[PDB]
Design a protein around this nucleic acid. Structure first.
Ligand SMILES: Nc1nc2c(ncn2[C@H]2C[C@H](O)[C@@H](COP(=O)(O)OP(=O)(O)OP(=O)(O)O)O2)c(=O)[nH]1
Ligand SMILES: [Mg+2]
Ligand SMILES: [Mg+2]
Ligand SMILES: [Mg+2]
Length: 342
DNA sequence: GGGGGAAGGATTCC
DNA sequence: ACGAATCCTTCCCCC
């Protein structure tokens, strides 16, 4: 009977910049995402507690970060470097199990059902791993432990930052009971506002509702997931997830609408994009446009054969042309996205 | 009806 | 105000 270990790295990006210059440690760090529209324009990717302490988190404008903390250290995002770093740490969890699911860049799940016998021995294996990474890589994590991936993640969510927490089989009930419902994975404000109205505040509130309204309300899938979870019967296993799509979406230097000028940003997007594909040939391709007021439209197309960079360019025009058509608005951003690899 | 499946908007979250 | 996997919904051609 199953025990899942979820490991998340504390303020990952921000921490990689600290690991690479401890002269930053103890200071408020903000990894920012620029664009080139107006000096210090962009958004916040992540920020260590010092800055996160005073409300500076992700997706929030770079100015609002300064107006709050003018003396904070701001650094552009640098995936490349962060990717290497992670992979290594991710190659170290692979030493603890073959039943491993790498969900993101900062987190993975382990099925230690056959390495440890219980929560003291598992939570034992926890501390061991927090140290085996804190010493070899200079990166602290947070470990969550319960019976299904869903609850493991949650465990760790609480016990943060830098911490290990386990939710025995008893607390699952304390939580299918007490745990708010919007503090659940896959339940962003949209769906929560829905549940609100549905007169649902906790996991259990679903258990007492005519499914069919829950279906049309949130969408059968979420509907079955919430139910199956509230009935201590949720249990999808740890599966190695495969990259299913790739794509870049750069931000133009100024809201536009004539084809010619728009074109180049897009070719750069397909350019970088392709470098990232590497050895991977896709059969699909979309063109994503972010209108002037931040809405979205994207046209696509699938081929019976794998796309070539030379073909990628042609289609990424008939699709931009198709977009610049029925949608009139001015175009703010734009970019390409390749799916359906061969 | 119902399957196979492609298109595009929506929704969560790193 | 800055990538992706899943989910849903319509649209569709052919058995
Ligand atoms: N570009 C961008 N990056 C984000 C956003 N949200 C999160 N990230 C990135 C920054 C983090 O280094 C990486 C992992 O995010 P986490 O939610 O696990 O937080 P982080 O690792 O920063 O520390 P945390 O666990 O949140 O205390 O995801 C976002 O909205 N935009
Ligand atoms: Mg993290
Ligand atoms: Mg939520
Ligand atoms: Mg996370």
């Amino acid at each position: 009977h199953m025990i899942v270990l979820f490991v998340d790295f504390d303020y990952f990006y921000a921490q990689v910049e600290e690991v690479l210059n401890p002269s930053l440690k103890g200071k408020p760090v903000v990894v920012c995402v620029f664009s080139g529209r107006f000096e210090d324009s962009g958004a916040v990717a992540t920020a260590n507690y010092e800055a996160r302490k005073f409300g500076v988190k992700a997706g929030i404008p770079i100015v609002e970060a300064k107006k709050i903390l003018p003396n904070a250290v701001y650094l552009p995002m640098r995936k490349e470097v962060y990717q290497q770093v992670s992979s290594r740490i991710m190659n170290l969890l692979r030493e603890y199990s073959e039943k491993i699911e790498i969900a993101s860049i900062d987190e993975a799940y382990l099925d230690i059902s056959d390495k440890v016998r219980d929560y003291r021995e598992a939570y034992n294996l926890g501390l061991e791993i927090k140290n085996k990474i804190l010493e070899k890589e200079k990166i602290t994590v947070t470990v969550g432990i319960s019976k299904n991936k869903v609850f493991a993640k949650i465990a760790a969510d609480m016990a943060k930052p830098n911490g290990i927490k386990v939710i025995d089989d008893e607390e699952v009930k304390r939580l299918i009971r007490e745990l708010d419902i919007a503090d659940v994975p896959g339940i962003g404000n949209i769906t929560a506002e829905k549940l609100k109205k549905l007169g649902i505040n906790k996991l259990v509130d679903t258990l007492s509702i005519e499914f069919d309204k829950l279906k049309g309300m949130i969408g059968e899938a979420k509907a079955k997931y919430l139910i199956s979870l509230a009935r201590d019967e949720y249990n999808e296993p740890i599966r190695t997830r495969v990259r299913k799509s790739i794509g870049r979406i750069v931000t133009m230097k100024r809201n536009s609408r004539n084809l010619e000028e728009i074109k180049p940003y897009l070719f750069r997007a397909i350019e970088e994009s392709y470098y990232k594909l590497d050895k991977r040939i896709p059969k699909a391709i979309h063109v994503v446009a972010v209108t002037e007021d931040l809405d979205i439209v994207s046209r696509g197309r699938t081929f019976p054969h794998g796309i070539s960079k030379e073909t990628a360019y042609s289609e990424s025009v008939k699709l931009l042309q198709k977009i610049l058509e029925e949608d009139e608005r001015k175009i703010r951003r734009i970019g390409v996205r390749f799916s359906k690899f061969i």
